Amino acid sequence: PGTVDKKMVEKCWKLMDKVVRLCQNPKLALKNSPPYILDLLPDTYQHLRTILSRYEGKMETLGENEYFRVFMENLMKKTKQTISLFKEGKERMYEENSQPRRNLTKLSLIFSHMLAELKGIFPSGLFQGDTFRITKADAAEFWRKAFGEKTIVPWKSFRQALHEVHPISSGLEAMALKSTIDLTCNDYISVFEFDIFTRLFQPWSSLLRNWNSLAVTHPGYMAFLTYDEVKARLQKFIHKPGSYIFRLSCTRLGQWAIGYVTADGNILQTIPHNKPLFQALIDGFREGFYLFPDGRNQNPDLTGLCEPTPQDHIKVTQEQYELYCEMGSTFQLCKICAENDKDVKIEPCGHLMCTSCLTSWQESEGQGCPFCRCEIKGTEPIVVDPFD
């Protein structure tokens, strides 16, 4: 890549602006649901604006941040590519079915991904990339030991690392892995993209065997599909209840969105409340909801990754334990309800409580962790061994 200056940044502005204009064409009639580009691009500009104003004369050290640089070169290559998708598309742009239109749709998504990432890295406008919290303990542990505090790495550097930990069978399987995890399609892996992927493919314990089984060998997996496209694809199957497909949710990145055809002939989409994908699939199947992947009679057996190696029980240190005798309580108990033992761990913050309470707080409309108020990107079920 190369360094980022105000003069460049004003160019990205014009390019994004063109793309906007090319997408406001009354013949296009872009459907307004996410990802919706006339939302994405202006909101990106907005957040780009917030970022810039925060660095005052400090624009020196903003242009020299590796992540920001990779991002601009990628935002620039992605608009150039969209503007060039219009010149070479001509009127095939106004046919909802065209291969050219399908490529616009795939771009909308890449844009949502880029914007989610940007805000993951510069939440308030200030670069947080170095302190970014990886949601999964064991995934965070891998990134730290391997890459330290880096925000972004070359895909080659990423393959080499992961292979030492999670062996990649071949070159082909590596391309498949790349295409899946590189959401911004930039040939790097940000700490944000890493997070999404390991959220989607948990448990970290067997990460690839998970992703092999839910994506590589699964007919139900749809990559870079929109909400609307999922609607359209199931239509062909609307006469055949039990047919399902699943994709990434674009509005909640790191979460799965399962589309399905109900016994009455309607298409619903659902995002599993935090749980692992394979269990929602296995239960869904067992209960009769998810039967025919992409409409095919044959449905895969997921019980293989069923029981991962169990996350070790937490054990209380004497020094911690003695305090709770004083405090007039016991370490393993939910401090929200003072009733149930803590059965659940919130990630990334780390806080323990009971699932029964975490559910009630979420259903009550409550934002984030009930303690620190930070975002809840994950849950790891757990059991405590009291120090006694």
Binding site: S33, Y227, Y260, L268, T270
Partner: peptide, 9 residues
């Protein structure tokens, strides 16, 4: 009302 619905049970 974002288009997603509660999981089937």
């Amino acid at each position: 009302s974002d288009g997603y619905t509660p999981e089937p049970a």
